[PDB]
Design a protein around this ligand. Sequence first.
Ligand code: HEC
Length: 103
Amino acid sequence: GDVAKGKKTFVQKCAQCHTVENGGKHKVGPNLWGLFGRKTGQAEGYSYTDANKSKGIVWNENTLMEYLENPKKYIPGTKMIFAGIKKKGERQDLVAYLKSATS
Ligand code: HEC
């Protein structure tokens, strides 16, 4: 159900870039393994200084709305090229997308 729609948006803006299976393997964004337990940083090879870290943090139910918001204002300076996602509809659904596919 509304996790269907996350992967739809997932093949539309998150799909072609991240991998997704067990360590899928990097290629632009590392594997996004299991959002649920980790702070920003340390995931199997990183790269980069402030951003992601800098701010330094936690992946949690929130903070992915936090990010999901728009990568401009928030760890503001992430090297991931993104436009937006600044809507309740698509932004809610994402946060379900990562809790059904990631774990
Ligand atoms: C669909 C909207 C995408 C979602 C959801 C995520 N990304 Fe990305 N993303 C990209 C990069 C390069 C990073 C790592 C590099 C850097 O910004 O410092 C990421 C990282 C994430 C993270 C990071 C998780 C962690 O800390 O380990 C999350 C939660 C995640 N992204 C969500 C780059 C790209 C990207 C390429 C163009 C696309 C289109 C997306 N990201 C899309 C999503």
